[PDB]
From Swiss-Prot, chain A:
UniProt disease annotation: Amyotrophic lateral sclerosis 1: A neurodegenerative disorder affecting upper motor neurons in the brain and lower motor neurons in the brain stem and spinal cord, resulting in fatal paralysis. Sensory abnormalities are absent. The pathologic hallmarks of the disease include pallor of the corticospinal tract due to loss of motor neurons, presence of ubiquitin-positive inclusions within surviving motor neurons, and deposition of pathologic aggregates. The etiology of amyotrophic lateral sclerosis is likely to be multifactorial, involving both genetic and environmental factors.
Organism: Homo sapiens
GO cellular component: axon cytoplasm; cytoplasm; cytoplasmic vesicle; cytosol; dendrite cytoplasm; dense core granule; extracellular exosome; extracellular region
Modified residue annotations for Phosphoserine: S98, S102, S105, S107
Family: Belongs to the Cu-Zn superoxide dismutase family.
Protein name: Superoxide dismutase [Cu-Zn]
Effect of substituting D90A: In ALS1; does not seem to be linked with a decrease in activity
Lineage, top ranks: Eukaryota, Metazoa, Chordata, Craniata, Vertebrata
GO molecular function: copper ion binding; identical protein binding; protein homodimerization activity; protein phosphatase 2B binding; protein-folding chaperone binding; small GTPase binding; superoxide dismutase activity; zinc ion binding
Pfam families: Sod_Cu
Modified residues (N6-succinyllysine): K3, K9, K91, K122, K136
UniProtKB/Swiss-Prot annotation, chain B:
In-chain residues carrying the UniProt-annotated modification N6-acetyllysine: K120, K134
Organism of provenance: Homo sapiens
Function text: Destroys radicals which are normally produced within the cells and which are toxic to biological systems.
Gene that this polypeptide is encoded by: SOD1
Binding site for Zn(2+): H61, H69, H78, D81
Xref: CDD domains: Cu-Zn_Superoxide_Dismutase
UniProt keyword Iron present: no
Disulfide bond positions: C55-C144
Keywords attached to this entry: Acetylation, Amyotrophic lateral sclerosis, Antioxidant, Copper, Cytoplasm, Disease variant, Disulfide bond, Lipoprotein, Metal-binding, Neurodegeneration, Nucleus, Oxidoreductase, Palmitate, Phosphoprotein, Ubl conjugation, Zinc
Effect on the protein of changing D81A: Loss of zinc binding and enhanced tendency to form aggregates
Known outcome of mutating D81S: Destabilization of dimer and loss of zinc binding
Protein name: Superoxide dismutase [Cu-Zn]
Lipid-linked residues (S-palmitoyl cysteine): C6
Length: 153, 151
Protein backbone atom coordinates (compact mmCIF):
# COMPACT_ATOMS: atom_id res chain seq x y z
CA UNK A 1 0.00 0.00 0.00
CA UNK A 2 0.83 3.69 0.64
CA UNK A 3 3.34 6.13 -0.95
CA UNK A 4 4.89 5.73 -4.44
CA UNK A 5 6.87 7.93 -6.84
CA UNK A 6 7.74 8.03 -10.52
CA UNK A 7 10.24 10.34 -12.21
CA UNK A 8 9.13 10.79 -15.80
CA UNK A 9 12.03 11.30 -18.19
CA UNK A 10 12.20 11.12 -22.02
CA UNK A 11 14.25 12.16 -25.09
CA UNK A 12 12.56 15.53 -25.50
CA UNK A 13 11.62 18.32 -23.09
CA UNK A 14 8.85 16.69 -21.02
CA UNK A 15 9.76 15.71 -17.49
CA UNK A 16 7.96 15.54 -14.16
CA UNK A 17 7.56 13.82 -10.79
CA UNK A 18 4.35 12.01 -9.99
CA UNK A 19 3.58 10.98 -6.46
CA UNK A 20 0.98 8.39 -5.48
CA UNK A 21 -0.68 8.14 -2.09
CA UNK A 22 -3.08 5.40 -0.95
CA UNK A 23 -4.36 5.95 2.62
CA UNK A 24 -6.51 2.83 3.02
CA UNK A 25 -5.40 -0.44 1.42
CA UNK A 26 -8.06 -1.69 -1.00
CA UNK A 27 -9.36 1.70 -2.13
CA UNK A 28 -8.56 4.99 -3.86
CA UNK A 29 -5.19 6.33 -4.97
CA UNK A 30 -4.61 10.05 -5.16
CA UNK A 31 -2.23 10.70 -8.02
CA UNK A 32 -0.58 14.10 -8.08
CA UNK A 33 2.38 16.06 -9.32
CA UNK A 34 3.81 18.16 -12.08
CA UNK A 35 5.01 17.61 -15.66
CA UNK A 36 6.73 20.19 -17.87
CA UNK A 37 7.59 20.69 -21.52
CA UNK A 38 4.23 19.56 -22.89
CA UNK A 39 2.01 21.23 -25.47
CA UNK A 40 -1.06 22.97 -24.11
CA UNK A 41 -4.10 20.74 -23.95
CA UNK A 42 -4.89 17.13 -23.22
CA UNK A 43 -2.39 14.29 -22.85
CA UNK A 44 -2.85 10.57 -22.40
CA UNK A 45 -1.74 9.24 -19.08
CA UNK A 46 -1.60 5.52 -18.25
CA UNK A 47 0.17 2.76 -16.47
CA UNK A 48 1.70 0.30 -18.92
CA UNK A 49 2.27 -3.36 -18.11
CA UNK A 50 6.06 -3.53 -17.77
CA UNK A 51 8.55 -1.52 -15.74
CA UNK A 52 10.91 -2.20 -18.60
CA UNK A 53 12.93 0.78 -19.90
CA UNK A 54 15.59 -1.15 -21.80
CA UNK A 55 14.33 0.03 -25.21
CA UNK A 56 13.03 3.29 -23.80
CA UNK A 57 9.32 3.95 -23.30
CA UNK A 58 8.57 1.35 -25.99
CA UNK A 59 9.53 -1.48 -23.64
CA UNK A 60 6.78 -0.64 -21.15
CA UNK A 61 4.46 -2.51 -23.45
CA UNK A 62 0.66 -2.15 -23.64
CA UNK A 63 -1.46 -0.50 -20.94
CA UNK A 64 -1.59 -2.42 -17.66
CA UNK A 65 -4.52 -4.72 -18.43
CA UNK A 66 -4.87 -7.37 -15.64
CA UNK A 67 -8.49 -8.01 -16.57
CA UNK A 68 -7.80 -8.02 -20.30
CA UNK A 69 -10.66 -5.73 -21.28
CA UNK A 70 -10.83 -2.96 -23.89
CA UNK A 71 -9.38 0.56 -23.62
CA UNK A 72 -11.62 3.16 -22.04
CA UNK A 73 -11.65 6.25 -19.89
CA UNK A 74 -11.22 6.17 -16.09
CA UNK A 75 -15.00 6.30 -15.45
CA UNK A 76 -16.05 3.54 -17.86
CA UNK A 77 -16.49 -0.03 -16.52
CA UNK A 78 -14.94 -1.35 -19.71
CA UNK A 79 -11.49 0.18 -19.10
CA UNK A 80 -7.89 -0.90 -18.75
CA UNK A 81 -6.49 -0.81 -15.21
CA UNK A 82 -3.76 1.50 -16.44
CA UNK A 83 -6.42 3.81 -17.88
CA UNK A 84 -6.10 7.12 -16.07
CA UNK A 85 -7.44 9.02 -19.08
CA UNK A 86 -5.90 12.51 -19.49
CA UNK A 87 -3.94 15.19 -17.72
CA UNK A 88 -3.96 18.81 -18.79
CA UNK A 89 -1.09 21.16 -19.66
CA UNK A 90 -1.51 24.89 -19.32
CA UNK A 91 0.50 27.22 -21.44
CA UNK A 92 4.08 27.11 -20.23
CA UNK A 93 3.42 23.49 -21.13
CA UNK A 94 2.97 22.65 -17.46
CA UNK A 95 0.59 19.99 -16.24
CA UNK A 96 -0.15 20.07 -12.54
CA UNK A 97 -1.62 16.58 -12.26
CA UNK A 98 -4.35 15.82 -9.72
CA UNK A 99 -6.20 12.52 -10.08
CA UNK A 100 -8.09 10.14 -7.87
CA UNK A 101 -8.56 6.62 -9.08
CA UNK A 102 -10.05 3.57 -7.38
CA UNK A 103 -9.10 0.92 -9.94
CA UNK A 104 -5.30 1.27 -9.94
CA UNK A 105 -3.65 0.30 -6.65
CA UNK A 106 -0.35 0.29 -4.74
CA UNK A 107 -1.13 -2.94 -2.87
CA UNK A 108 -1.76 -6.16 -4.80
CA UNK A 109 -3.17 -7.68 -8.00
CA UNK A 110 -4.03 -4.32 -9.53
CA UNK A 111 -0.74 -3.18 -7.98
CA UNK A 112 0.96 -0.85 -10.48
CA UNK A 113 4.29 -0.85 -8.65
CA UNK A 114 7.35 -1.63 -10.73
CA UNK A 115 5.15 -0.73 -13.67
CA UNK A 116 5.51 2.18 -16.13
CA UNK A 117 3.50 5.38 -16.14
CA UNK A 118 3.35 7.16 -19.51
CA UNK A 119 2.31 10.66 -20.58
CA UNK A 120 1.53 10.91 -24.32
CA UNK A 121 1.94 13.03 -27.42
CA UNK A 122 -1.79 13.60 -27.87
CA UNK A 123 -5.19 13.48 -26.22
CA UNK A 124 -6.57 10.15 -25.12
CA UNK A 125 -10.00 9.73 -26.79
CA UNK A 126 -11.25 7.46 -23.96
CA UNK A 127 -12.37 4.68 -26.36
CA UNK A 128 -14.80 7.04 -28.15
CA UNK A 129 -12.59 7.37 -31.27
CA UNK A 130 -14.39 5.01 -33.70
CA UNK A 131 -11.30 3.15 -34.90
CA UNK A 132 -9.53 0.03 -33.69
CA UNK A 133 -6.68 2.07 -32.21
CA UNK A 134 -9.14 3.90 -29.99
CA UNK A 135 -9.90 0.56 -28.33
CA UNK A 136 -6.19 -0.09 -27.63
CA UNK A 137 -4.55 3.23 -26.77
CA UNK A 138 -7.37 5.70 -27.17
CA UNK A 139 -5.28 7.22 -29.99
CA UNK A 140 -2.96 8.92 -27.51
CA UNK A 141 0.10 8.72 -29.82
CA UNK A 142 3.80 8.63 -28.96
CA UNK A 143 5.22 8.24 -25.46
CA UNK A 144 6.86 11.55 -24.59
CA UNK A 145 8.29 10.45 -21.22
CA UNK A 146 7.93 7.56 -18.79
CA UNK A 147 9.30 6.10 -15.56
CA UNK A 148 9.12 3.07 -13.32
CA UNK A 149 6.68 3.44 -10.41
CA UNK A 150 8.77 2.83 -7.31
CA UNK A 151 8.38 2.77 -3.55
CA UNK A 152 8.61 6.04 -1.62
CA UNK A 153 9.14 6.65 2.17
CA UNK B 1 6.32 -11.51 -10.29
CA UNK B 2 8.65 -14.03 -11.97
CA UNK B 3 10.72 -11.73 -14.19
CA UNK B 4 12.20 -8.32 -13.52
CA UNK B 5 14.81 -5.95 -14.91
CA UNK B 6 16.46 -2.63 -14.12
CA UNK B 7 18.17 -0.08 -16.33
CA UNK B 8 21.05 1.13 -14.23
CA UNK B 9 21.53 4.69 -15.41
CA UNK B 10 23.78 7.34 -13.94
CA UNK B 11 24.63 10.97 -14.67
CA UNK B 12 28.15 9.84 -15.61
CA UNK B 13 29.66 7.17 -17.90
CA UNK B 14 28.50 4.17 -15.82
CA UNK B 15 25.48 2.30 -17.20
CA UNK B 16 24.01 -1.15 -17.82
CA UNK B 17 21.02 -3.50 -17.74
CA UNK B 18 20.39 -6.14 -15.08
CA UNK B 19 17.88 -8.99 -15.13
CA UNK B 20 16.06 -11.01 -12.45
CA UNK B 21 14.36 -14.42 -12.61
CA UNK B 22 12.39 -16.17 -9.87
CA UNK B 23 10.40 -19.44 -9.78
CA UNK B 24 9.47 -18.37 -2.79
CA UNK B 25 12.75 -19.58 -4.28
CA UNK B 26 16.08 -17.92 -5.22
CA UNK B 27 16.71 -15.04 -7.63
CA UNK B 28 19.12 -15.06 -10.56
CA UNK B 29 20.57 -11.61 -11.09
CA UNK B 30 22.44 -11.22 -14.38
CA UNK B 31 23.41 -8.57 -16.90
CA UNK B 32 26.33 -6.30 -17.68
CA UNK B 33 27.63 -2.88 -16.58
CA UNK B 34 30.08 -0.57 -18.38
CA UNK B 35 32.12 2.60 -17.86
CA UNK B 36 33.37 1.30 -14.52
CA UNK B 37 36.86 1.61 -13.05
CA UNK B 38 38.63 -1.75 -12.97
CA UNK B 39 38.31 -3.64 -9.70
CA UNK B 40 35.49 -4.50 -7.30
CA UNK B 41 32.35 -2.36 -7.22
CA UNK B 42 29.69 -2.25 -4.53
CA UNK B 43 26.35 -3.21 -5.90
CA UNK B 44 22.97 -3.80 -4.29
CA UNK B 45 19.49 -2.73 -3.29
CA UNK B 46 18.41 0.46 -1.49
CA UNK B 47 15.07 1.15 0.18
CA UNK B 48 13.27 3.65 -2.05
CA UNK B 49 12.45 3.60 -5.76
CA UNK B 50 12.89 7.36 -5.75
CA UNK B 51 15.02 8.95 -8.49
CA UNK B 52 13.68 12.40 -7.65
CA UNK B 53 17.09 13.86 -6.71
CA UNK B 54 19.11 11.18 -8.50
CA UNK B 55 20.61 8.14 -6.78
CA UNK B 56 20.68 10.03 -3.46
CA UNK B 57 16.92 9.78 -2.92
CA UNK B 58 17.13 6.00 -2.99
CA UNK B 59 18.27 6.36 0.61
CA UNK B 60 19.91 3.69 2.79
CA UNK B 61 20.41 0.05 1.72
CA UNK B 62 17.22 -2.05 1.75
CA UNK B 63 17.15 -3.35 5.27
CA UNK B 64 13.79 -4.86 6.33
CA UNK B 65 15.31 -6.39 9.49
CA UNK B 66 17.32 -3.47 10.96
CA UNK B 67 20.84 -4.96 10.75
CA UNK B 68 24.50 -4.14 10.06
CA UNK B 69 25.80 -3.90 6.52
CA UNK B 70 27.37 -7.02 4.99
CA UNK B 71 28.54 -9.24 2.14
CA UNK B 72 25.98 -11.53 0.50
CA UNK B 73 27.00 -14.52 2.64
CA UNK B 74 27.37 -12.88 6.07
CA UNK B 75 24.45 -13.74 8.35
CA UNK B 76 24.42 -10.07 9.38
CA UNK B 77 23.55 -7.95 6.37
CA UNK B 78 21.09 -5.64 4.74
CA UNK B 79 18.61 -7.78 2.80
CA UNK B 80 19.63 -5.67 -0.16
CA UNK B 81 23.35 -6.44 0.28
CA UNK B 82 24.78 -7.98 -2.88
CA UNK B 83 28.37 -7.17 -2.11
CA UNK B 84 30.50 -6.89 -5.20
CA UNK B 85 30.36 -7.26 -8.92
CA UNK B 86 33.70 -7.38 -10.69
CA UNK B 87 34.39 -4.94 -13.49
CA UNK B 88 36.93 -6.54 -15.80
CA UNK B 89 39.79 -4.45 -17.20
CA UNK B 90 37.32 -2.96 -19.68
CA UNK B 91 35.03 -1.56 -17.01
CA UNK B 92 32.58 -4.28 -18.06
CA UNK B 93 31.09 -6.21 -15.18
CA UNK B 94 29.56 -9.53 -16.22
CA UNK B 95 26.95 -9.94 -13.50
CA UNK B 96 25.65 -13.30 -12.33
CA UNK B 97 24.30 -14.07 -8.86
CA UNK B 98 21.78 -16.38 -7.24
CA UNK B 99 21.00 -14.61 -3.97
CA UNK B 100 18.19 -16.22 -1.98
CA UNK B 101 18.33 -13.45 0.61
CA UNK B 102 16.46 -11.29 -1.94
CA UNK B 103 13.27 -11.98 -3.94
CA UNK B 104 10.84 -10.51 -6.48
CA UNK B 105 7.82 -11.36 -4.35
CA UNK B 106 8.14 -11.28 -0.59
CA UNK B 107 8.32 -9.01 2.41
CA UNK B 108 11.76 -8.70 0.85
CA UNK B 109 10.25 -7.79 -2.52
CA UNK B 110 13.09 -6.04 -4.35
CA UNK B 111 10.50 -4.73 -6.82
CA UNK B 112 9.94 -0.99 -6.90
CA UNK B 113 13.37 -0.38 -5.30
CA UNK B 114 16.63 1.09 -6.63
CA UNK B 115 19.56 -1.05 -7.67
CA UNK B 116 22.81 0.85 -7.08
CA UNK B 117 26.42 0.45 -8.13
CA UNK B 118 29.18 2.28 -6.28
CA UNK B 119 32.50 4.07 -6.45
CA UNK B 120 34.50 1.53 -4.49
CA UNK B 121 34.43 -1.92 -2.92
CA UNK B 122 31.76 -3.02 -0.49
CA UNK B 123 33.84 -3.51 2.67
CA UNK B 124 31.44 -6.37 3.30
CA UNK B 125 31.36 -4.72 6.72
CA UNK B 126 34.77 -5.77 8.04
CA UNK B 127 36.18 -2.29 7.36
CA UNK B 128 37.12 -1.34 10.90
CA UNK B 129 34.86 1.69 11.19
CA UNK B 130 31.34 3.09 11.49
CA UNK B 131 31.05 3.80 7.79
CA UNK B 132 31.69 0.16 6.77
CA UNK B 133 28.92 -0.70 9.22
CA UNK B 134 26.40 1.10 7.01
CA UNK B 135 27.69 1.09 3.41
CA UNK B 136 30.87 -0.97 3.34
CA UNK B 137 32.80 2.18 2.40
CA UNK B 138 31.36 1.70 -1.11
CA UNK B 139 31.37 5.46 -1.63
CA UNK B 140 29.39 7.51 -4.12
CA UNK B 141 26.42 6.20 -6.12
CA UNK B 142 27.61 6.04 -9.72
CA UNK B 143 24.42 4.60 -11.19
CA UNK B 144 20.96 3.33 -10.23
CA UNK B 145 17.54 2.35 -11.57
CA UNK B 146 14.14 1.26 -10.27
CA UNK B 147 13.55 -2.45 -10.26
CA UNK B 148 10.53 -3.16 -12.39
CA UNK B 149 8.43 -6.03 -13.70
CA UNK B 150 9.82 -7.39 -16.99
CA UNK B 151 7.97 -9.24 -19.76
CU1 LIG C 1 -0.20 5.09 -22.30
CU1 LIG D 1 24.64 0.73 -2.34
ZN1 LIG E 1 -5.77 1.67 -22.01
ZN1 LIG F 1 24.18 -2.66 3.24
Amino acid sequence: ATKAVCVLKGDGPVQGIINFEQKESNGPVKVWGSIKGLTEGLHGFHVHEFGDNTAGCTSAGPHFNPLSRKHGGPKDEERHVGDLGNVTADKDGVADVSIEDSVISLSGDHCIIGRTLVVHEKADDLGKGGNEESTKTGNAGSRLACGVIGIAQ
